[PDB]
């Protein structure tokens, strides 16, 4: 999912409900964990007692266990920005609904343009997701112009991932941005 640090979650922990930054509870879990293992640049902890709200296999947004959190270095990520000043940061190997010779396709975001038409769900927060959810979620879509693609740096040097068994996506950020892993 390779979020950046910043993006606000909606988790309850050891039983209890918060609002944080990603980056600032998986630097905190990996930190005070003795569970850490690694695949090359990636750091893995498992954890207990977090849920985070996802849509799940019965097609409802509610809290869902995470079975483990990880984070790993990045050098950049793509900032789009859409009109109305909505925005957002994700690393290069996510891919968004684009209106492409006529139809709606997922698009990686470093082959995007300024000008080109995103589909963005009409919704308050962005959602991360492993598998396909539009048009399955209940929900309307707007149609908006890409007005910037900047290149930026992540606010903590490092990219992070949540795993979220029987939903493989989750809700993180905001702007009603869809982003596939691609
Ligand atoms: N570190
Ligand atoms: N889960
Ligand atoms: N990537
Ligand atoms: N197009
Ligand atoms: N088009
Ligand atoms: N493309």
């Known amino acids: 999912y390779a979020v950046d640090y910043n993006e ?17 509870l998986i630097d905190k879990i990996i930190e005070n964990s003795e569970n850490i ?11 207990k007692g977090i849920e985070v709200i996802a849509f799940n296999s019965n097609y409802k947004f509610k809290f869902m266990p995470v079975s483990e959190v990880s984070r790993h270095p990045v050098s950049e990520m793509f900032e789009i920005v859409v009109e109305g000043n909505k925005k957002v940061r994700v690393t290069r190997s996510h ?30 927060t962005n959602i991360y997701t492993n598998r396909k959810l539009e048009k399955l979620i209940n929900s309307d879509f707007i149609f908006l112009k890409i ?10 040097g490092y990219a992070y991932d949540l795993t979220v068994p029987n939903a493989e996506n ?13």
């Open 8 to 24: 606000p979650i909606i988790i309850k922990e050891n039983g209890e409900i918060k609002v944080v930054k990603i980056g600032e």
């Open 147 to 156: 007005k910037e693609i900047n290149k930026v740096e992540p606010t903590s």
């Open 95 to 124: 891919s968004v609904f684009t209106i492409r010779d006529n139809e709606v396709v997922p698009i990686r975001v470093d082959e995007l343009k300024v000008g080109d038409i995103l589909v963005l769900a009409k919704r308050i």
């Open 37 to 47: 293992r690694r695949e090359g640049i990636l750091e893995i902890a498992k954890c």
């Open 170 to 182: 989750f809700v993180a950020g905001f702007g009603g941005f869809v982003l596939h892993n691609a």
